[PDB]
Design a protein around this ligand. Structure first.
Ligand SMILES: [Zn+2]
Lengths: 244, 8
């Protein structure tokens, strides 16, 4: 506790990296198993450009379902805790692999979305892009109102480059950080998984919060097991008191 | 690190 609490409380520029594990307690599967709708594919076999070219209706049906579930979900104790850490001025920037909007919904202000967002729909051809309040019904295939081309979810698919400006911004944030909380990520997906290494390489501390050991665990200064929500809730309660 | 979104 005390050394961990002190590390967070006394941090000069704390950042965070979150993954699917912080949203499971809102009812959103981690998508480390199967696709969650048919349960016939690995999620990576649908979230890619090859699948979308083969059968855009199938891929859109999956995303429409994903969108509805997220839009109907509520933020949980982990999302609330991260928002509270920003509110208290400890957390400077929240980097997330998640395509849900539950961090924002909990009141997080400075969020970087490495893999885009289910709230965003964009054109496959022109530069048209917009946000949705609710999920489209599939079929029909959603078409761009500006040019008539096929629309797609505003997420980064496996095999696609992260938007250079987004990844660059995340890199600059971890280049400033003396402490990083890495919560609910399996530390497998690149280049996202390389971000905490930058903090360590520059002499900072890594606090891993995850129910299981990961490839990051060997270099994590602290690695906390248990349920993401419960651990983050307890952690922010202690940090708030420590700074009070 | 960079490169395309991928599993390690
Ligand atoms: Zn268009």
């Amino acid at each position: 506790d005390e050394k961990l609490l002190k590390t967070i409380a006394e941090s000069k520029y704390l950042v965070a990296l979150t993954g699917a594990g912080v949203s499971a307690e809102s009812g959103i599967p981690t998508f480390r198993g199967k696709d969650g709708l048919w349960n016939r594919y690995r999620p990576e076999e649908l979230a890619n450009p090859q699948a979308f070219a083969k059968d855009p209706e199938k891929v859109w049906k999956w995303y429409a379902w994903r969108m509805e579930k997220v839009f109907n979900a509520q933020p949980n104790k982990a999302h609330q805790a991260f928002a509270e850490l920003e509110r208290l001025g400890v957390l400077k920037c929240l980097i997330t692999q998640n395509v849900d909007d539950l961090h924002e919904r909990a009141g997080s202000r400075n969020v970087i979305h490495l893999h885009g967002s289910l709230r965003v729909v964009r054109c496959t051809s022109c530069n048209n892009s917009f946000e949705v309040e609710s999920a489209p019904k599939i079929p029909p295939l959603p078409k761009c109102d500006k040019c008539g081309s096929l629309l797609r979810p505003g997420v980064v698919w496996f095999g696609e480059m992260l938007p250079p400006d987004v990844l660059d911004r995340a890199m600059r944030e971890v280049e400033r950080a003396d402490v990083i909380i890495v919560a609910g990520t399996s530390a497998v997906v690149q280049p996202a998984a390389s971000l905490p290494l930058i903090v360590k390489q520059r002499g900072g501390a890594i606090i891993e919060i995850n129910p299981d050991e990961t490839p990051l665990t060997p270099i994590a200064d602290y690695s906390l097991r248990g349920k993401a929500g419960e651990v983050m809730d307890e952690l922010v309660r202690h940090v708030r008191k420590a700074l009070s | 690190k960079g490169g395309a979104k991928r599993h390690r």
